[PDB]
Design a protein around this motif. Structure first.
Motif, PDB file in Angstrom:
ATOM      1  N   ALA A 407       0.824  -1.216   0.000  1.00  0.00           N
ATOM      2  CA  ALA A 407       0.000   0.000   0.000  1.00  0.00           C
ATOM      3  C   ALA A 407       0.859   1.268   0.000  1.00  0.00           C
ATOM      4  O   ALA A 407       0.946   1.962   0.998  1.00  0.00           O
ATOM      5  CB  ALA A 407      -0.940  -0.006   1.197  1.00  0.00           C
ATOM      6  N   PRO A 408       1.478   1.582  -1.139  1.00  0.00           N
ATOM      7  CA  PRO A 408       2.491   2.629  -1.168  1.00  0.00           C
ATOM      8  C   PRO A 408       1.987   4.051  -0.916  1.00  0.00           C
ATOM      9  O   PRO A 408       2.800   4.955  -0.761  1.00  0.00           O
ATOM     10  CB  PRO A 408       3.097   2.501  -2.570  1.00  0.00           C
ATOM     11  N   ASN A 409       0.676   4.254  -0.863  1.00  0.00           N
ATOM     12  CA  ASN A 409       0.127   5.585  -0.551  1.00  0.00           C
ATOM     13  C   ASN A 409      -0.309   5.729   0.893  1.00  0.00           C
ATOM     14  O   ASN A 409      -0.746   6.795   1.326  1.00  0.00           O
ATOM     15  CB  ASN A 409      -1.009   5.950  -1.504  1.00  0.00           C
ATOM     16  N   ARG A 410      -0.146   4.664   1.656  1.00  0.00           N
ATOM     17  CA  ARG A 410      -0.602   4.656   3.034  1.00  0.00           C
ATOM     18  C   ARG A 410       0.547   4.841   4.014  1.00  0.00           C
ATOM     19  O   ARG A 410       1.408   3.976   4.147  1.00  0.00           O
ATOM     20  CB  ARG A 410      -1.337   3.359   3.324  1.00  0.00           C
ATOM     21  N   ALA A 411       0.522   5.971   4.710  1.00  0.00           N
ATOM     22  CA  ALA A 411       1.522   6.293   5.697  1.00  0.00           C
ATOM     23  C   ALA A 411       1.312   5.480   6.957  1.00  0.00           C
ATOM     24  O   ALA A 411       0.193   5.314   7.412  1.00  0.00           O
ATOM     25  CB  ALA A 411       1.484   7.776   6.026  1.00  0.00           C
ATOM     26  N   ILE A 412       2.409   4.984   7.520  1.00  0.00           N
ATOM     27  CA  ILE A 412       2.375   4.261   8.778  1.00  0.00           C
ATOM     28  C   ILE A 412       3.516   4.698   9.666  1.00  0.00           C
ATOM     29  O   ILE A 412       4.423   5.413   9.248  1.00  0.00           O
ATOM     30  CB  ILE A 412       2.490   2.740   8.584  1.00  0.00           C
ATOM     31  N   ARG A 413       3.453   4.229  10.898  1.00  0.00           N
ATOM     32  CA  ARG A 413       4.466   4.483  11.891  1.00  0.00           C
ATOM     33  C   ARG A 413       5.119   3.166  12.253  1.00  0.00           C
ATOM     34  O   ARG A 413       4.501   2.092  12.197  1.00  0.00           O
ATOM     35  CB  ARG A 413       3.851   5.104  13.148  1.00  0.00           C
ATOM     36  N   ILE A 414       6.388   3.262  12.614  1.00  0.00           N
ATOM     37  CA  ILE A 414       7.135   2.125  13.102  1.00  0.00           C
ATOM     38  C   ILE A 414       7.770   2.536  14.411  1.00  0.00           C
ATOM     39  O   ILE A 414       8.436   3.566  14.495  1.00  0.00           O
ATOM     40  CB  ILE A 414       8.211   1.671  12.098  1.00  0.00           C
ATOM     41  N   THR A 415       7.539   1.728  15.436  1.00  0.00           N
ATOM     42  CA  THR A 415       8.041   1.995  16.776  1.00  0.00           C
ATOM     43  C   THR A 415       9.370   1.300  16.968  1.00  0.00           C
ATOM     44  O   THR A 415       9.770   0.454  16.164  1.00  0.00           O
ATOM     45  CB  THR A 415       7.079   1.476  17.862  1.00  0.00           C
ATOM     46  N   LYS A 416      10.051   1.636  18.054  1.00  0.00           N
ATOM     47  CA  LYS A 416      11.384   1.085  18.290  1.00  0.00           C
ATOM     48  C   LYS A 416      11.360  -0.414  18.603  1.00  0.00           C
ATOM     49  O   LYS A 416      12.258  -1.147  18.195  1.00  0.00           O
ATOM     50  CB  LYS A 416      12.106   1.836  19.393  1.00  0.00           C
ATOM     51  N   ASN A 417      10.321  -0.853  19.310  1.00  0.00           N
ATOM     52  CA  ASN A 417      10.097  -2.291  19.572  1.00  0.00           C
ATOM     53  C   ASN A 417      10.057  -3.136  18.294  1.00  0.00           C
ATOM     54  O   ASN A 417      10.479  -4.298  18.278  1.00  0.00           O
ATOM     55  CB  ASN A 417       8.779  -2.500  20.323  1.00  0.00           C
ATOM     56  N   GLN A 418       9.549  -2.535  17.224  1.00  0.00           N
ATOM     57  CA  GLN A 418       9.342  -3.241  15.977  1.00  0.00           C
ATOM     58  C   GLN A 418      10.602  -3.390  15.125  1.00  0.00           C
ATOM     59  O   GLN A 418      10.523  -3.947  14.037  1.00  0.00           O
ATOM     60  CB  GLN A 418       8.287  -2.522  15.141  1.00  0.00           C
ATOM     61  N   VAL A 419      11.755  -2.913  15.592  1.00  0.00           N
ATOM     62  CA  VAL A 419      12.927  -2.816  14.710  1.00  0.00           C
ATOM     63  C   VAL A 419      14.059  -3.751  15.075  1.00  0.00           C
ATOM     64  O   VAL A 419      14.419  -4.652  14.311  1.00  0.00           O
ATOM     65  CB  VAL A 419      13.500  -1.373  14.646  1.00  0.00           C
ATOM     66  N   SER A 420      14.660  -3.504  16.220  1.00  0.00           N
ATOM     67  CA  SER A 420      15.863  -4.230  16.564  1.00  0.00           C
ATOM     68  C   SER A 420      16.267  -3.878  17.950  1.00  0.00           C
ATOM     69  O   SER A 420      16.340  -2.709  18.310  1.00  0.00           O
ATOM     70  CB  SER A 420      17.017  -3.907  15.617  1.00  0.00           C
ATOM     71  N   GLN A 421      16.561  -4.913  18.710  1.00  0.00           N
ATOM     72  CA  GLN A 421      16.930  -4.773  20.101  1.00  0.00           C
ATOM     73  C   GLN A 421      18.397  -4.345  20.247  1.00  0.00           C
ATOM     74  O   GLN A 421      18.840  -4.058  21.347  1.00  0.00           O
ATOM     75  CB  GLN A 421      16.683  -6.100  20.832  1.00  0.00           C
ATOM     76  N   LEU A 422      19.148  -4.312  19.140  1.00  0.00           N
ATOM     77  CA  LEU A 422      20.568  -3.891  19.164  1.00  0.00           C
ATOM     78  C   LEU A 422      20.749  -2.380  19.024  1.00  0.00           C
ATOM     79  O   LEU A 422      21.871  -1.893  19.058  1.00  0.00           O
ATOM     80  CB  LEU A 422      21.392  -4.607  18.083  1.00  0.00           C
ATOM     81  N   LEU A 423      19.649  -1.650  18.872  1.00  0.00           N
ATOM     82  CA  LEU A 423      19.695  -0.197  18.727  1.00  0.00           C
ATOM     83  C   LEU A 423      19.926   0.483  20.067  1.00  0.00           C
ATOM     84  O   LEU A 423      19.801  -0.152  21.097  1.00  0.00           O
ATOM     85  CB  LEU A 423      18.411   0.305  18.072  1.00  0.00           C
ATOM     86  N   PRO A 424      20.288   1.776  20.059  1.00  0.00           N
ATOM     87  CA  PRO A 424      20.491   2.534  21.302  1.00  0.00           C
ATOM     88  C   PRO A 424      19.245   2.623  22.174  1.00  0.00           C
ATOM     89  O   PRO A 424      18.154   2.753  21.655  1.00  0.00           O
ATOM     90  CB  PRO A 424      20.831   3.943  20.805  1.00  0.00           C
ATOM     91  N   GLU A 425      19.421   2.598  23.488  1.00  0.00           N
ATOM     92  CA  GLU A 425      18.300   2.733  24.429  1.00  0.00           C
ATOM     93  C   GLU A 425      17.968   4.206  24.681  1.00  0.00           C
ATOM     94  O   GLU A 425      16.823   4.559  24.953  1.00  0.00           O
ATOM     95  CB  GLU A 425      18.611   2.026  25.755  1.00  0.00           C
ATOM     96  N   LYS A 426      18.982   5.055  24.594  1.00  0.00           N
ATOM     97  CA  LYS A 426      18.792   6.496  24.729  1.00  0.00           C
ATOM     98  C   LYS A 426      19.474   7.240  23.565  1.00  0.00           C
ATOM     99  O   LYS A 426      20.326   6.684  22.858  1.00  0.00           O
ATOM    100  CB  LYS A 426      19.221   7.005  26.110  1.00  0.00           C
ATOM    101  N   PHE A 427      19.062   8.487  23.368  1.00  0.00           N
ATOM    102  CA  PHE A 427      19.411   9.255  22.166  1.00  0.00           C
ATOM    103  C   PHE A 427      20.154  10.565  22.431  1.00  0.00           C
ATOM    104  O   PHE A 427      20.437  11.332  21.510  1.00  0.00           O
ATOM    105  CB  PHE A 427      18.156   9.456  21.325  1.00  0.00           C
ATOM    106  N   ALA A 428      20.527  10.770  23.689  1.00  0.00           N
ATOM    107  CA  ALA A 428      21.321  11.928  24.092  1.00  0.00           C
ATOM    108  C   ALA A 428      22.218  11.587  25.258  1.00  0.00           C
ATOM    109  O   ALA A 428      21.889  10.764  26.104  1.00  0.00           O
ATOM    110  CB  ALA A 428      20.428  13.096  24.462  1.00  0.00           C
ATOM    111  N   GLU A 429      23.359  12.249  25.295  1.00  0.00           N
ATOM    112  CA  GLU A 429      24.312  12.088  26.366  1.00  0.00           C
ATOM    113  C   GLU A 429      25.233  13.294  26.370  1.00  0.00           C
ATOM    114  O   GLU A 429      25.232  14.106  25.436  1.00  0.00           O
ATOM    115  CB  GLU A 429      25.128  10.796  26.202  1.00  0.00           C
ATOM    116  N   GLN A 430      26.039  13.391  27.414  1.00  0.00           N
ATOM    117  CA  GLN A 430      26.988  14.477  27.516  1.00  0.00           C
ATOM    118  C   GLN A 430      28.368  13.930  27.716  1.00  0.00           C
ATOM    119  O   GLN A 430      28.553  12.949  28.430  1.00  0.00           O
ATOM    120  CB  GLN A 430      26.640  15.404  28.671  1.00  0.00           C
ATOM    121  N   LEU A 431      29.323  14.572  27.061  1.00  0.00           N
ATOM    122  CA  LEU A 431      30.722  14.259  27.232  1.00  0.00           C
ATOM    123  C   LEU A 431      31.406  15.472  27.815  1.00  0.00           C
ATOM    124  O   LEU A 431      31.224  16.585  27.330  1.00  0.00           O
ATOM    125  CB  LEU A 431      31.354  13.869  25.890  1.00  0.00           C
ATOM    126  N   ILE A 432      32.184  15.245  28.866  1.00  0.00           N
ATOM    127  CA  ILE A 432      32.915  16.313  29.545  1.00  0.00           C
ATOM    128  C   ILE A 432      34.415  16.150  29.357  1.00  0.00           C
ATOM    129  O   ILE A 432      34.993  15.167  29.806  1.00  0.00           O
ATOM    130  CB  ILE A 432      32.595  16.321  31.044  1.00  0.00           C
TER     131      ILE A 432
END
Ligand SMILES: Cc1cn([C@H]2C[C@H](O)[C@@H](COP(=O)(O)OP(=O)(O)OP(=O)(O)O)O2)c(=O)[nH]c1=O
Ligand SMILES: Cc1cn([C@H]2C[C@H](O)[C@@H](COP(=O)(O)OP(=O)(O)OP(=O)(O)O)O2)c(=O)[nH]c1=O
Ligand SMILES: Cc1cn([C@H]2C[C@H](O)[C@@H](COP(=O)(O)OP(=O)(O)OP(=O)(O)O)O2)c(=O)[nH]c1=O
Ligand SMILES: [Mg+2]
Ligand SMILES: [Mg+2]
Ligand SMILES: [Mg+2]
Ligand SMILES: [Mg+2]
Lengths: 481, 492, 481, 492
Positions: A407-432
């Motif tokens: 259905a190439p005209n139908r927009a959908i969402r994909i959540t993080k659960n649906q992808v891969s458990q090897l991905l990052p758990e968080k998306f920001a950090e600080q380096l000092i």
């Protein structure tokens, strides 16, 4: 007036529409030839001599490529050659506002030189684009090629800086929302600007690019999301999308936030600060400006480029002696010494308010060791670095829409659960990062003791070389066990 | 605090640098010390291809990175020759000396590299004779003395007064039978590495082929690593010289073909040359008014900065922007030329031609050529009359690096069956598809009047001039001057 | 006998020592010219026509490069030219045991054709190396170049397959432990084999390589860890090390486990199984072997390559009709249809014992929808894919030792806390792909309903296209909300 | 279920394929349908460079991927010409037809590509005249009929009997004044895209330059994308023809120089050629004993498989391994030659020479050359006597694609000022550094006796032969035959 063919090492032979040529061939645009893309990075990566100019041509070219492809596949989108031009122009002009050494200028120098103001290169690009248009009689040339200047100029500025204020845009309506996603994508950071700099920075740095922008284009469509027509990626390309952001993070990690490149930026900024009272730049009506005030007059700013570094270096004026002497230390490679690096633990977040207070903290640590010197707050530099996926704490893929084969005209969402458990758990950090302005062996040894002690006191992470640089300090903290 | 055979182990750590062309390179501390000086860092501010950047937007690279590469390759080549042939007695001292000469070969370049000694200095100061190579010697001396390099040299096994002299010889050639003093005949091959005066096969080319290509967007077809694997040192006369494997002769001709292609496509680009010309003009009009402070506070001009290395240190591409950003009314003419460059209002290209047979345009006469063009009498009805001063005539010498000569006639080879025996290979022995000649001249004509009527006129004058001089028919002759080409039936 | 120079597109001009040449120029080694590196991958990636042969030359070359560099920097290690040769030979010979279509053979075919046996290509390499040595009189040539055949042959085999059984190795002692880390690194997977295939596979696939092996070499040292001398990486290269494994995972994700490439491997395996009773391969003493039994005789195995695919395809024998017909379906691109993909949730782990039972489960799902067909267990293929960092659940970086700038002979450890919070939280996962052997529109629609229902019943992740392929099934599961 | 202007929107999805050379390519369903046949997939099993893989280990690429690339580039070129010049009336039907011809140009190649029609067939069946191009026509016909392609063609706007004929013409040339029937004179330029018989400028080269280079480890210096941007269609005589921008003439000469370099370095490698020779020998000795089943169960040989497309479909590089793995005692001689290849026991290279002046070795006489070499009488004391059958003499024609002719004499150009006006550029007008001639011959000699004494003897016979025939002095002449070279003082 005819098209020009131009050869770019990244994109190959590119066609430039005469209107683009006309914009390109102005003092305001040519200025970008004298501003290095990576600023001080060139002093660490000798291949990184590339300037904003060639990057800007590339963005403009890719912007046109993306819009053209979307149009060929989906005529129902009603993309006109006028739209294409407007997107190309915004691509070309997105970086007009950069100052000397690019991000050094609005990232380091202006905040220190003029704390009362709020300045971004993007705002500068708007002002500089306006100045370019008016000073070079561009509007009639725009009209000659089917553009409607009052609408389209406004459109171009919106694409560069975002909303100038519900659908918040005026230059184009909701059913061309996707045109705002091309040059500078505020929703999820997927845009052609990245695509150019990934490839171009890599070519120059000596690091290989792993993202394939041409594949992305082939798997891109426009689909209804709410009332907007938006760019959607093929569902199974989600893995490649995460890798795109991973590539971005790797480039920042390896190159853009290099510990020595950052110190060179710092040193250059220091020189600029010490020169700022004494350097004069002539702007509109003969009026004088400083490095820090040149941003208020586009005529002066036009003449403010990397040249300033050499004007300072080659100067004889005794009042520039302090500035000049810092740049000379750069040439002799007598740089501030790197002490170490650490991070916050758990969910602790260092607020920018407090950045200024950190050197005092380091100097106030009380390492229980014998030292030959005492270091002061002013001997330390504490550089806090925010590393993230472009949207602070957020996952950009949560703000991407996808389509499926069936259905190439139908927009959908994909959540993080649906992808891969090897991905990052968080998306920001600080380096000092911590450095010491005292460069001898005894001061550096001391700085290390202060630093690791500081890390221990603050419950920060154990520096990687902790046991080697401060063996007497690390046993103390059994969290580091 | 580790020991082996009862002696303490000392860990020396080299600096690693990442170059996009050569990858991760190791820099010996002595090289680092030389690199980290105002005299060497200066090369960060001089573009390799000068005005080429204004035609090829990738060509933003500077002499600095090229110099690191030459230095690296010089060491690679020497090291490889040594590994294969210990009998040559190549020492780590020799290696360093060749690396240093590689690093420092370009210290003498001025603003926009070859524009400076190729165009500007000859026009600004005709009485002098100046080359960037001489500049490199002077600048290397200045670098050495100002930064206390000699004791550091000694620390790493070098003998400064021998080796400094050696390094200079490698850069500029003989400084006054075996003409070199830094090394004897049995290390003659060391003089062939950085700058090869005998046949032009050296590591300088190897770097710029690869680096220029990477930046220009033109792909390199010469393989320097292959060459190294097929290179040996053999007795030729009483010198030990670098020899190539016999069957690599085809690849050698191609090396020079690559060089000629790069000059043809990029270095002598018709618009790149005009930008060099325009920049040079600006410099000439600024030369009386710009001051550069040198040794003991003395003042110098752009044209006289070459006499003082302290002033010259401060003479880089910056001068272009100093002129562009200046407000002084006395720089108005200079500044205005640079502004024309920014607005892309350049001198218009008219066309190109060559001499016929073996006629050669003498350099004496270059200055007289614009008058000739203006004096041509084309039978075309025109709206304007053009003068000598409206024309630029740029004569370009294209060759294989040794004027009329074939470099391969000055290369020695070895065979698989007898790898220590040097031989010669003649042109007859190789391929009849190769060039018959090794030098030629290209004549480009431009017009400083840029409107449509002047340009149409210039074209008529130009093609008429070509006909009168028996030059070759311009490629677009029948289209730019249809009324002029029929007269000459040699052009049929 | 002299060296040969050989031109490899990946590594450039390489020198081959005459001893290596002698090993290379045998039927046993040349055989690798007829076995594709990526097996069925060539049927998805048309550039991937490269064979094990050229990969093996590359591994052998890189092995020598790494050992040579370690030796130049640290003479105290006593690396001899004999050691270099032994490591080069193991590099060359590591892949001698691969069969038709590489990993398809020992990964898919042999386990199905002969379940009673336990076979790995690595064991095959040992057997084939022995066979190569004895059949070509290599031992005296080894002796001629300073090798001690009984010791060194044993050493070479250990490097390839691991311990042949406390220090468990016999070919070299503990103070040359680092020599076992070069070709095939069982401790942490950092070896030159990867380095070659990353670069070579990328060159052929049309995917760009992001790992820099030459940088790694420059930042590599040998340091005492316990009683062993081991390869250590510079501390600040830890980020690049994580990226190395990320590159590996990306290549598996994009290319090696391609959903269609896997189906082609499956189909080829099926053909082989149906041909296995009828194809004869002549081995030692004229004895006959099958595809499945050729592994027992190195003489027969020498003649077992990708050729078998074409022998089957071109055959006329009516007994090969079934085999031949499967290969023809591949040529007509009439492949098994992909249904979808999912993963286990939480810490659930699908055991290999149960793989065989999964098609029955899918067929036994009871989707509450109207269907035109009923599908059976045999109509489904369920391909379970283990994606990990090379050491199951483990983080390879926990098994890497590092050194610091200030103390380059001192080995240290770096923990995950000390690096970056943007890294993966876990290092293994499973991907479950489902396909249907019935290819018409009605069967495929049905298969999708069975599949998504199965996912719901098992508490597996919502397929990415779930709402589109099975809109009536997804609301049912509010975990998918 | 989306609508625009009241009509339903239909989403057609193309297959995307990733090629390392061209990146992500879109394949039209009609192309996919042609691709996914036994006749086309066959090309997966035929190596592009034949025996080249046994010298260049990267050269494992097959005709399949090359064919996809040609098809893709053919479409790219046609599309670009069309976008720039709508007046040409290029239709999506024309595009498809050119893409299909691109895909299918190589369908006729046999085992090891050019080895098959270049070496094997002429030796195995001298009475016939066979070319891979003819094979492609036959195979394309067979592909079309066996897979029901015609109705699929119709479905996408093609007219099969016109267009099929057109496609064949593009591949093989005229099938019997304007000689083509598939398209008229005002689409003459469509015949120049896939296989350009007039001047050799076509997309087939463009693909193999890039693809061969990528695999071989030799870098490509020709820029096809630049060429496309500087290409137009102009009236030449009464045909509309592809013309190049005038100032790209230098790049055009370089295109052919690249072609010659690739032949020189790779395609005619002295050892690659010997491997082709040895494989051909094996095939010849196997040809009586190998059976290939074709149409109606009929049996064919390797040499006769070309008569039946069904048999030929099953004739690929596989034959090499069928021979290698065979047990049949009647294949023992064939098998033994292939085993010598595996053990790297190859015929030894003796040397190389060329004819002098404008002497040309006629193909008639190739067969007589080994007798000549063996009949030479070198004044050297030797341990062995060699016979005609011990020698191989491989004559190699190296040229610019059109025998003695300069391809650029058959190229038309346009100028910036008049882009619709075709012109000619002569060799005089361009550069005196270009080749004087466009064809030559290289003569390689090998010896089937491989021991040290025979090889030493062969060398003496060879150089003596060269002296007797007034051929060029071999490059290693003085080293391989020091006693023979002095006699000839033309060689001094
Ligand atoms: C001549 C030439 C230019 N270039 C580059 C330089 C430019 O970036 C781009 C276009 O250059 P040109 O085609 O040389 O453009 P031009 O403006 O000089 O020609 P004209 O006005 O006569 O048509 O291509 C090549 O890459 N290769 C070449 O061979
Ligand atoms: C960190 C990093 C640097 N570089 C480049 C930048 C430099 O040109 C070269 C050396 O960089 P570093 O190894 O970062 O050198 P350094 O001097 O900063 O480190 P230290 O003193 O701690 O040993 O490599 C990479 O190519 N990749 C990388 O990941
Ligand atoms: C998944 C993937 C494939 N490829 C290659 C393999 C093929 O040559 C080409 C197309 O691959 P896919 O896009 O995977 O094609 P598909 O036919 O498997 O997918 P679908 O039918 O679901 O649309 O791209 C990549 O280059 N990168 C990738 O990440
Ligand atoms: Mg132009
Ligand atoms: Mg450092
Ligand atoms: Mg050889
Ligand atoms: Mg598909």
């Amino acid at each position: 007036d005819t098209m020009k063919v131009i050869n770019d090492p990244i994109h190959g032979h590119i066609e430039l529409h005469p209107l683009l040529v006309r914009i390109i061939d102005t003092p305001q645009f040519q200025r970008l030839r004298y501003i290095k893309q990576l600023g001080g990075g060139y002093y660490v990566f000798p291949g990184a001599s590339h300037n904003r100019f060639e990057h800007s041509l590339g963005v403009g070219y890719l912007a046109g490529c993306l819009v053209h492809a979307l149009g060929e596949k989906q005529p129902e989108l009603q993309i006109s050659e006028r739209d294409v031009l407007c997107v190309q122009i915004a691509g070309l002009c997105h970086d007009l506002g950069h100052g000397p050494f690019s991000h050094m200028f609005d990232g380091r120098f202006i905040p220190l030189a003029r704390p009362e103001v709020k300045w971004t290169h993007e705002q500068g690009s708007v002002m500089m684009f306006e100045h370019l248009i008016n000073s070079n009689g561009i509007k009639p040339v725009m009209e000659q090629y089917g553009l409607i200047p009052e609408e389209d100029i406004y459109f171009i500025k919106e694409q560069i800086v975002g909303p100038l204020e519900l659908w918040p845009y005026k230059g184009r309506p909701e059913n061309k929302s996707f045109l705002y996603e091309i040059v500078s994508n505020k929703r999820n950071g997927i845009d052609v600007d990245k695509w150019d700099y990934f490839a171009r920075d890599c070519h120059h740095l000596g690091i290989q690019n792993n993202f394939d922008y041409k594949r992305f284009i082939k798997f891109a469509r426009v689909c209804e999301v709410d009332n907007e027509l938006r760019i959607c990626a093929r569902d199974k390309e989600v893995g490649n999308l995460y890798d795109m952001f991973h590539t971005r993070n790797s480039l920042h990690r390896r190159a853009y936030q290099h510990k020595v490149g950052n110190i060179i930026d710092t040193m250059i900024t220091d020189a600029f600060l010490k020169a700022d009272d004494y350097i004069e730049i002539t702007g509109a009506g003969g009026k004088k400006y400083r490095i820090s005030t040149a941003i208020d007059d586009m005529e002066a700013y036009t003449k403010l480029t990397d040249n300033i570094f050499l004007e300072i270096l080659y100067s004889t004026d005794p009042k520039l002696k302090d500035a000049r002497e810092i740049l000379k230390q750069i040439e002799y490679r007598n740089l501030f010494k790197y002490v170490g690096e650490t991070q916050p633990t758990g969910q602790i977040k260092i607020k920018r308010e407090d950045y200024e207070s950190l050197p005092k903290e380091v100097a106030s640590a009380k390492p229980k060791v014998l030292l030959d010197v005492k270091l002061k707050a002013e001997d330390f530099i504490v550089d806090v670095i925010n590393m993230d996926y472009g949207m602070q704490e957020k996952n950009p893929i949560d703000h991407v829409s996808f389509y499926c084969k069936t259905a190439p005209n139908r927009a959908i969402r994909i959540t993080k659960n649906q992808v891969s458990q090897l991905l990052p758990e968080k998306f920001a950090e600080q380096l000092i990062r911590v450095y010491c302005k005292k460069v001898d062996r005894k001061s550096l040894y001391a700085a290390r003791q202060y630093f690791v002690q500081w890390c221990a006191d603050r419950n920060f992470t154990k520096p990687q070389d902790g046991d080697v640089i401060a063996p007497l300090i690390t046993p103390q903290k059994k969290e580091w066990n």
